[PDB]
Design a protein around this ligand. Sequence first.
Ligand SMILES: C[As](C)(=O)[O-]
Ligand SMILES: C[As](C)(=O)[O-]
Ligand SMILES: C[As](C)(=O)[O-]
Ligand SMILES: C[As](C)(=O)[O-]
Ligand SMILES: [Zn+2]
Ligand SMILES: [Zn+2]
Ligand SMILES: [Zn+2]
Ligand SMILES: [Zn+2]
Ligand SMILES: [Zn+2]
Ligand SMILES: [Zn+2]
Ligand SMILES: [Zn+2]
Length: 76
Amino acid sequence: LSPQYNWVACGILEGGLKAAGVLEEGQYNRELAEAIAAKGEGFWTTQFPQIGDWNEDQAAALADRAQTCGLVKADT
Ligand SMILES: C[As](C)(=O)[O-]
Ligand SMILES: C[As](C)(=O)[O-]
Ligand SMILES: C[As](C)(=O)[O-]
Ligand SMILES: C[As](C)(=O)[O-]
Ligand SMILES: [Zn+2]
Ligand SMILES: [Zn+2]
Ligand SMILES: [Zn+2]
Ligand SMILES: [Zn+2]
Ligand SMILES: [Zn+2]
Ligand SMILES: [Zn+2]
Ligand SMILES: [Zn+2]
Protein backbone atom coordinates (compact mmCIF):
# COMPACT_ATOMS: atom_id res chain seq x y z
CA LEU A 1 0.00 0.00 0.00
CA SER A 2 1.47 3.27 -1.20
CA PRO A 3 1.20 6.18 1.29
CA GLN A 4 0.52 8.29 -1.79
CA TYR A 5 -3.15 7.23 -1.60
CA ASN A 6 -3.80 7.22 2.16
CA TRP A 7 -6.43 9.56 3.62
CA VAL A 8 -3.80 12.18 4.54
CA ALA A 9 -2.40 12.42 1.02
CA CYS A 10 -5.91 12.30 -0.46
CA GLY A 11 -7.15 14.89 2.03
CA ILE A 12 -4.31 17.29 1.14
CA LEU A 13 -5.19 16.76 -2.54
CA GLU A 14 -8.90 17.38 -1.81
CA GLY A 15 -8.26 20.57 0.27
CA GLY A 16 -5.86 21.89 -2.37
CA LEU A 17 -8.30 21.28 -5.25
CA LYS A 18 -11.13 22.95 -3.29
CA ALA A 19 -8.90 25.95 -2.43
CA ALA A 20 -7.91 26.19 -6.11
CA GLY A 21 -11.62 26.39 -7.06
CA VAL A 22 -11.58 23.31 -9.34
CA LEU A 23 -13.17 20.56 -7.22
CA GLU A 24 -16.90 20.40 -6.52
CA GLU A 25 -19.77 18.08 -5.60
CA GLY A 26 -21.11 15.29 -7.84
CA GLN A 27 -18.30 16.09 -10.20
CA TYR A 28 -17.20 13.57 -12.81
CA ASN A 29 -13.53 12.92 -13.56
CA ARG A 30 -13.88 14.67 -16.94
CA GLU A 31 -15.36 17.83 -15.34
CA LEU A 32 -12.54 18.14 -12.82
CA ALA A 33 -9.92 17.67 -15.56
CA GLU A 34 -11.62 20.42 -17.58
CA ALA A 35 -11.76 22.72 -14.60
CA ILE A 36 -8.04 22.18 -13.84
CA ALA A 37 -7.12 22.80 -17.50
CA ALA A 38 -9.17 26.01 -17.61
CA LYS A 39 -7.29 27.37 -14.57
CA GLY A 40 -3.94 26.23 -16.03
CA GLU A 41 -4.48 28.33 -19.19
CA GLY A 42 -2.41 31.49 -19.58
CA PHE A 43 0.18 33.16 -21.73
CA TRP A 44 2.20 29.98 -22.43
CA THR A 45 -0.70 27.64 -23.21
CA THR A 46 -2.06 30.14 -25.69
CA GLN A 47 1.25 30.69 -27.49
CA PHE A 48 2.60 27.09 -27.73
CA PRO A 49 0.55 23.95 -28.62
CA GLN A 50 2.98 21.75 -26.67
CA ILE A 51 2.27 23.73 -23.49
CA GLY A 52 -1.49 23.66 -24.14
CA ASP A 53 -1.14 19.90 -24.51
CA TRP A 54 0.96 19.58 -21.33
CA ASN A 55 -1.76 21.53 -19.48
CA GLU A 56 -4.52 19.14 -20.68
CA ASP A 57 -2.45 16.01 -20.04
CA GLN A 58 -1.47 17.04 -16.50
CA ALA A 59 -5.05 18.13 -15.74
CA ALA A 60 -6.22 14.67 -16.88
CA ALA A 61 -3.57 12.94 -14.75
CA LEU A 62 -4.44 15.00 -11.67
CA ALA A 63 -8.17 14.30 -12.08
CA ASP A 64 -7.28 10.60 -12.33
CA ARG A 65 -5.43 10.85 -8.99
CA ALA A 66 -8.48 12.60 -7.50
CA GLN A 67 -10.73 9.75 -8.68
CA THR A 68 -8.39 7.20 -7.09
CA CYS A 69 -8.69 9.26 -3.90
CA GLY A 70 -12.52 8.93 -4.19
CA LEU A 71 -13.00 12.66 -4.85
CA VAL A 72 -14.80 12.46 -8.22
CA LYS A 73 -17.00 9.99 -10.14
CA ALA A 74 -15.80 7.70 -12.97
CA ASP A 75 -16.80 8.38 -16.52
CA THR A 76 -19.63 6.31 -17.87
C1 LIG B 1 -14.59 25.92 -11.87
AS1 LIG B 1 -15.99 24.80 -11.07
C2 LIG B 1 -15.54 22.91 -11.33
O1 LIG B 1 -16.10 25.12 -9.36
O2 LIG B 1 -17.51 25.16 -11.85
C1 LIG C 1 -20.46 26.96 -7.58
AS1 LIG C 1 -20.51 26.21 -9.40
C2 LIG C 1 -21.68 27.32 -10.53
O1 LIG C 1 -18.92 26.16 -10.09
O2 LIG C 1 -21.15 24.59 -9.27
C1 LIG D 1 -18.92 16.55 0.58
AS1 LIG D 1 -17.43 17.31 -0.44
C2 LIG D 1 -17.78 19.23 -0.68
O1 LIG D 1 -15.97 17.10 0.48
O2 LIG D 1 -17.23 16.56 -1.99
C1 LIG E 1 -15.78 11.40 -1.08
AS1 LIG E 1 -16.06 13.33 -0.84
C2 LIG E 1 -17.47 13.57 0.50
O1 LIG E 1 -14.62 14.08 -0.24
O2 LIG E 1 -16.46 14.04 -2.38
ZN1 LIG F 1 -17.37 26.30 -8.77
ZN1 LIG G 1 -17.49 27.21 -10.50
ZN1 LIG H 1 -19.09 24.12 -11.06
ZN1 LIG I 1 -19.10 14.65 -1.78
ZN1 LIG J 1 -1.66 15.08 -25.05
ZN1 LIG K 1 0.72 14.93 -24.61
ZN1 LIG L 1 -14.99 15.71 0.30
